[PDB]
Design an enzyme around this catalytic site. Sequence first.
Site: not given
Ligand SMILES: CO[C@H]1C[C@@H]2CC[C@@H](C)[C@@](O)(O2)C(=O)C(=O)N2CCCC[C@H]2C(=O)O[C@H]([C@H](C)C[C@@H]2CC[C@@H](O)[C@H](OC)C2)CC(=O)[C@H](C)/C=C(\C)[C@@H](O)[C@@H](OC)C(=O)[C@H](C)C[C@H](C)/C=C/C=C/C=C/1C
Length: 107
Positions: A26, A36-37, A56, A82, A99
Amino acid sequence: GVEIETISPGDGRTFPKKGQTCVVHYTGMLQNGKKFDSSRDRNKPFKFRIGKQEVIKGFEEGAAQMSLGQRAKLTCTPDVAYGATGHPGVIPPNATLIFDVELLNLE
Ligand SMILES: CO[C@H]1C[C@@H]2CC[C@@H](C)[C@@](O)(O2)C(=O)C(=O)N2CCCC[C@H]2C(=O)O[C@H]([C@H](C)C[C@@H]2CC[C@@H](O)[C@H](OC)C2)CC(=O)[C@H](C)/C=C(\C)[C@@H](O)[C@@H](OC)C(=O)[C@H](C)C[C@H](C)/C=C/C=C/C=C/1C
Ligand SMILES: [Cl-]
Ligand SMILES: [Cl-]
Ligand SMILES: [Cl-]
Protein backbone atom coordinates in the site's frame (compact mmCIF):
# COMPACT_ATOMS: atom_id res chain seq x y z
CA GLY A 1 -17.50 4.95 3.80
CA VAL A 2 -14.91 3.34 1.56
CA GLU A 3 -15.07 3.89 -2.25
CA ILE A 4 -13.07 1.50 -4.41
CA GLU A 5 -11.78 2.32 -7.91
CA THR A 6 -9.89 -0.57 -9.59
CA ILE A 7 -6.38 0.15 -10.88
CA SER A 8 -5.78 -3.49 -12.10
CA PRO A 9 -8.27 -6.37 -11.88
CA GLY A 10 -7.75 -9.39 -9.66
CA ASP A 11 -8.71 -12.99 -10.43
CA GLY A 12 -12.38 -12.13 -9.66
CA ARG A 13 -12.74 -15.31 -7.57
CA THR A 14 -10.41 -15.45 -4.56
CA PHE A 15 -11.41 -12.98 -1.85
CA PRO A 16 -10.30 -12.70 1.82
CA LYS A 17 -12.09 -15.17 4.14
CA LYS A 18 -12.66 -15.37 7.92
CA GLY A 19 -9.44 -16.34 9.73
CA GLN A 20 -7.17 -15.39 6.82
CA THR A 21 -4.13 -13.09 6.78
CA CYS A 22 -4.15 -10.47 3.97
CA VAL A 23 -0.84 -9.65 2.42
CA VAL A 24 -0.77 -6.29 0.63
CA HIS A 25 1.34 -3.47 -0.68
CA TYR A 26 0.00 0.00 0.00
CA THR A 27 0.70 3.71 -0.39
CA GLY A 28 -1.29 6.18 1.69
CA MET A 29 -1.88 9.88 1.17
CA LEU A 30 -4.06 12.63 2.57
CA GLN A 31 -6.78 13.72 0.08
CA ASN A 32 -4.86 17.11 -0.05
CA GLY A 33 -1.96 15.15 -1.69
CA LYS A 34 0.63 14.58 1.07
CA LYS A 35 1.96 10.98 1.05
CA PHE A 36 2.37 9.65 4.55
CA ASP A 37 3.42 5.99 4.09
CA SER A 38 4.36 3.24 1.65
CA SER A 39 5.06 -0.42 2.30
CA ARG A 40 6.58 -0.48 -1.25
CA ASP A 41 9.43 1.86 -0.40
CA ARG A 42 10.42 -0.32 2.59
CA ASN A 43 10.27 -3.51 0.37
CA LYS A 44 8.14 -5.30 2.94
CA PRO A 45 4.53 -6.37 2.25
CA PHE A 46 2.05 -5.48 4.97
CA LYS A 47 0.06 -8.25 6.69
CA PHE A 48 -3.14 -8.05 8.68
CA ARG A 49 -5.85 -10.51 9.81
CA ILE A 50 -9.45 -10.28 8.55
CA GLY A 51 -12.11 -9.67 11.22
CA LYS A 52 -9.65 -8.83 14.03
CA GLN A 53 -10.08 -4.99 14.05
CA GLU A 54 -6.33 -4.67 13.39
CA VAL A 55 -6.67 -1.83 10.87
CA ILE A 56 -9.01 1.12 10.20
CA LYS A 57 -12.47 0.12 8.98
CA GLY A 58 -12.10 1.53 5.45
CA PHE A 59 -8.87 -0.32 4.76
CA GLU A 60 -10.28 -3.66 5.84
CA GLU A 61 -13.66 -3.14 4.07
CA GLY A 62 -11.75 -2.23 0.91
CA ALA A 63 -9.44 -5.28 1.11
CA ALA A 64 -12.41 -7.61 1.88
CA GLN A 65 -14.00 -6.76 -1.49
CA MET A 66 -10.78 -7.27 -3.48
CA SER A 67 -9.71 -10.46 -5.19
CA LEU A 68 -6.18 -11.90 -5.39
CA GLY A 69 -3.98 -9.72 -7.62
CA GLN A 70 -6.36 -6.75 -7.61
CA ARG A 71 -4.92 -3.25 -7.17
CA ALA A 72 -7.34 -0.47 -6.23
CA LYS A 73 -7.62 3.13 -5.06
CA LEU A 74 -9.51 3.26 -1.74
CA THR A 75 -10.97 6.61 -0.68
CA CYS A 76 -11.73 6.49 3.08
CA THR A 77 -13.94 9.13 4.64
CA PRO A 78 -12.87 10.07 8.23
CA ASP A 79 -15.65 7.95 9.82
CA VAL A 80 -13.98 4.78 8.43
CA ALA A 81 -10.44 6.08 9.11
CA TYR A 82 -9.24 8.18 12.12
CA GLY A 83 -12.34 10.39 12.54
CA ALA A 84 -12.39 13.50 14.71
CA THR A 85 -9.28 12.44 16.65
CA GLY A 86 -6.88 11.77 13.78
CA HIS A 87 -3.71 9.71 14.32
CA PRO A 88 -1.30 11.52 16.66
CA GLY A 89 1.36 13.48 14.81
CA VAL A 90 0.55 12.06 11.36
CA ILE A 91 -3.13 12.29 10.38
CA PRO A 92 -5.16 15.35 11.36
CA PRO A 93 -8.79 15.37 12.52
CA ASN A 94 -11.40 14.88 9.73
CA ALA A 95 -8.95 13.52 7.17
CA THR A 96 -10.14 11.70 4.08
CA LEU A 97 -7.45 9.16 3.20
CA ILE A 98 -6.47 7.65 -0.12
CA PHE A 99 -4.78 4.23 -0.23
CA ASP A 100 -3.44 2.49 -3.30
CA VAL A 101 -3.68 -1.19 -2.25
CA GLU A 102 -2.62 -4.37 -4.05
CA LEU A 103 -3.83 -7.72 -2.69
CA LEU A 104 -0.71 -9.91 -3.08
CA ASN A 105 -1.57 -13.09 -1.17
CA LEU A 106 -3.86 -14.71 1.38
CA GLU A 107 -2.31 -16.85 4.16
C1 LIG B 1 5.34 1.90 11.68
O1 LIG B 1 4.20 1.81 10.82
C2 LIG B 1 3.04 1.29 11.49
C3 LIG B 1 1.89 1.63 10.55
C4 LIG B 1 1.63 3.11 10.33
C5 LIG B 1 1.09 3.86 11.53
C6 LIG B 1 0.65 5.27 11.15
C7 LIG B 1 -0.35 5.26 9.99
C8 LIG B 1 -0.76 6.68 9.62
C9 LIG B 1 0.24 4.41 8.85
O2 LIG B 1 1.29 5.09 8.23
O3 LIG B 1 0.63 3.11 9.27
C10 LIG B 1 -0.77 4.04 7.74
O4 LIG B 1 -0.47 4.05 6.56
C11 LIG B 1 -2.15 3.62 8.12
O5 LIG B 1 -2.98 4.51 8.30
N1 LIG B 1 -2.43 2.30 8.23
C12 LIG B 1 -1.47 1.22 7.98
C13 LIG B 1 -1.97 0.26 6.91
C14 LIG B 1 -3.37 -0.25 7.25
C15 LIG B 1 -4.34 0.92 7.47
C16 LIG B 1 -3.81 1.89 8.53
C17 LIG B 1 -4.01 1.33 9.93
O6 LIG B 1 -5.06 0.87 10.28
O7 LIG B 1 -2.93 1.43 10.76
C18 LIG B 1 -3.08 0.95 12.13
C19 LIG B 1 -3.58 2.09 13.02
C20 LIG B 1 -2.54 3.20 13.12
C21 LIG B 1 -4.03 1.63 14.42
C22 LIG B 1 -5.16 0.61 14.56
C23 LIG B 1 -6.45 1.04 13.85
C24 LIG B 1 -7.59 0.03 14.06
C25 LIG B 1 -7.86 -0.23 15.54
O8 LIG B 1 -8.91 -1.18 15.66
C26 LIG B 1 -6.58 -0.72 16.22
O9 LIG B 1 -6.95 -0.82 17.60
C27 LIG B 1 -6.06 -1.60 18.39
C28 LIG B 1 -5.47 0.31 16.03
C29 LIG B 1 -1.75 0.33 12.54
C30 LIG B 1 -1.55 -1.07 12.01
O10 LIG B 1 -2.00 -1.42 10.94
C31 LIG B 1 -0.78 -2.03 12.91
C32 LIG B 1 -0.11 -3.13 12.08
C33 LIG B 1 -1.79 -2.62 13.87
C34 LIG B 1 -1.92 -2.37 15.17
C35 LIG B 1 -1.04 -1.40 15.89
C36 LIG B 1 -3.03 -3.02 16.02
O11 LIG B 1 -4.02 -3.68 15.25
C37 LIG B 1 -2.54 -4.00 17.10
O12 LIG B 1 -3.65 -4.22 17.93
C38 LIG B 1 -3.30 -4.72 19.23
C39 LIG B 1 -2.05 -5.30 16.48
O13 LIG B 1 -2.76 -6.28 16.50
C40 LIG B 1 -0.62 -5.34 15.95
C41 LIG B 1 -0.50 -6.32 14.77
C42 LIG B 1 0.36 -5.69 17.09
C43 LIG B 1 1.84 -5.50 16.78
C44 LIG B 1 2.69 -5.81 18.01
C45 LIG B 1 2.01 -4.08 16.32
C46 LIG B 1 2.56 -3.73 15.15
C47 LIG B 1 2.64 -2.36 14.70
C48 LIG B 1 2.94 -2.03 13.45
C49 LIG B 1 2.93 -0.68 12.96
C50 LIG B 1 3.17 -0.20 11.74
C51 LIG B 1 3.52 -1.06 10.55
CL1 LIG C 1 4.09 13.91 -0.70
CL1 LIG D 1 8.64 -5.99 -1.78
CL1 LIG E 1 3.53 -12.01 -1.28
